[PDB]
Amino acid sequence: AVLQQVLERTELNKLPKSVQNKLEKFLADQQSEIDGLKGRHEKFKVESEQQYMEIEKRLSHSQERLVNETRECQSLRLELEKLNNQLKALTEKNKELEMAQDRNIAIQSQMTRTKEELEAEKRDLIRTNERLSQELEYLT
């Protein structure tokens, strides 16, 4: 009953029951809406704040791990570069070792050639020796 607030007993009693009831309900309804709008909004406000607080933590986490990762890239690039030069040096040693092997295999190949040709020369002397020796026997 909000009507006794606005009007006076004399004025209010001059209103038919239907008129008061129509009025009472309408005031109640708009009053219900006021409490309704406040309830809805307040619950919304809580939701908005809670969601902002949580997406903030998600950013905090996203920021820190990007940071920890960025340093790690740098860590690799440094290590990458050091061993990259270390590899070149080893490659240099390897290529020098190959040329030595190539020189030695070539040397050995030549030394076999000289051996074989010497054996050929040696054989010629052997058969020549036989012929002289045998021919000598005729005159003994």
Added chain:
Amino acid sequence: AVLQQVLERTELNKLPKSVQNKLEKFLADQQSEIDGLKGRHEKFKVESEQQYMEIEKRLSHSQERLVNETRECQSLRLELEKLNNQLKALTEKNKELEMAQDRNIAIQSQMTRTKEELEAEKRDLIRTNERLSQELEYLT
């Protein structure tokens, strides 16, 4: 006119104007609060949404960059491993070549020994052949 919604034309005309004015003031005021509360919520929500969409973008951007860093980090970390194996493989190759060359020097040392020994035999055959040749001429 907030009063007209509630009552019909006949009803309203049996009311003294003062009664209507008092009713109007109360009705207007409650309606003013309603429109006021809705204005509040609607402006609040817009602010709430804009604050979210802006921090949402900062999370989105930070994530996309975190992705690019992870991808770039992994790309490097694998390469680190890759050339790390190249060192191991090459270090083994070098160790194999060093062992091979050392074996070859020994081989060459041997071949020279075999060579000199061949030249020795060859000289002997030369002297022997000369000796037989002379001996033949003596007896012919």
